[PDB]
Amino acid sequence: AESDFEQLPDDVAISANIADIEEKRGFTSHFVFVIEVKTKGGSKYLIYRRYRQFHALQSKLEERFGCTLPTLPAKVYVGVKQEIAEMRIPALNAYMKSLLSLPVWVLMDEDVRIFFYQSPYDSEQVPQALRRLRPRRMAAPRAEALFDFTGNSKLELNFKAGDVIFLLSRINKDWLEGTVRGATGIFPLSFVKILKDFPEEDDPTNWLRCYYYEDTISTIKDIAVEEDLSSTPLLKDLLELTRREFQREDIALNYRDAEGDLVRLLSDEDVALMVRQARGLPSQKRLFPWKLHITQKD
What residues does the PB1 domain cover? Predict the structure, then answer.
C-alpha cells in the first residue's frame, strides 16, 4: 500500500462520484452521467459517460484479465429513459469506487485510464452546462432567397426568389455556400434573409451530413448530433435517427468507401469500419468525417 500508491502519478483517479444526469440529444436521445473525478494530485474535474460506455469497459476489462473484477448489475430497469438512469446511479458509483480500488497494475490500464481522463469533448461540455443551468434538436442553417439569382459561373448557385436555401458553409463576407434541391453552389448573402443561422463558433454541437437520394434529385441534409465527434454508433442508432429525420423507414444507409465504391451498412461491424475508415479523412470543423448516403429501399 505505502509504496504501491506513491508510485502512481497525480493525474490518476482516486474517486469518481456522479454529480448529475443530463439528457443528450445524440444519435439516440439518451442520458449521460456527469461524473466528478478527483485525482491523487488533488484536482477535481467533470467527465461525461453514458451507461453503454461503462458496460463496454467491463467487457474490455474481462477480456484482458482472463483480486476480483466488479461487474455491473443484471438488467431490470424499465421506466422512462430518465428514470432507468437515475436508478443506475447507486449501482454506477459502486462500480467506480470498486474499480478505482483495484490494484495499481490494473488502474494503469490505458483503457481504464482513458475512461477517467477528461476529454476535449468532456471539457467543451462543462461551460455549456453552466450557461444553461443558470442562464443570463437544432435546425440546420437555412435562408430564404429574396430575389431571383442567376449564377455567373458553374460554381455559383441558381435559384428563384422565395426558395429555401440550406447553408452548407460560410465563404467570406459577401458570399455563402448553400444548396437548393440537388443544386449546390455559392451565392451573394445580400439575396437572402437568414432563417436559422450557423451554430455559434463555440457551440459543441456536432453534425452528421446525409446525402438523401430521392427519385429525381439528391439532397444534402445535416443533422444535429450531440455526441463526441469520434464516437461510433450502432447501426440501430443510425436507423432510428435517419427515420425521425426523413420521416420514413424503407431507406438504406450507405457510405462511400475510400476508393469510391458505395457500401451497404448492414452490420454494426460495418458502421464501426465506416467510422474507423473516415477517422483519418480531412476534418470539417463540426461535421463527422463519415457521411451517410441514404437511398430508397426496394
Answer: 205-297
Experimentally, the structure was elucidated by X-ray
Q: Is 44 annotated as a binding residue?
A: no
- Counting other chains too, the contacts that 183-191 makes at CB distance below 8 Å and 24 or more residues apart are 183/157, 183/158, 183/159, 184/157, 184/220, 185/151, 185/155, 185/156, 185/157, 185/158, 186/155, 186/156, 186/157, 187/149, 187/156, 187/157, 187/159, 188/149, 191/145, 191/146, 191/147, 191/149
Q: How far is CA 227 from the centre of its chain?
A: 2
Domains assigned to the chain: 1-136 (3.30.1520.10), 136-199 (2.30.30.40), 200-298 (3.10.20.90)
62: number of Cβ within 10 Å: 11
75 is in an annotated binding site: yes
Q: Is the distance from CB of 158 to CB of 149 less than 8 angstroms?
A: yes
Burial of 218 (0-12, 13-18, 19+ CB in 10 A): middle
CB atoms within 10 A of CB 187: 24
Is 104 annotated as belonging to a binding site?
no
Breaks, C-N > 2.5 A, in the chain lie after 66, 136
DSSP label of 59: H
Q: Is 77 assigned to a binding site?
A: yes
Q: What angle do CA 158, 159, 163 make, to 5 degrees?
A: 155
List the alpha helices (DSSP H) in 102-162.
104-107, 110-116, 120-133
286 is in an annotated binding site: no
Residue type (1 letter), 287: L
How is residue 189 annotated by DSSP?
Answer: G
Residue for grid cell 429574396 = 146
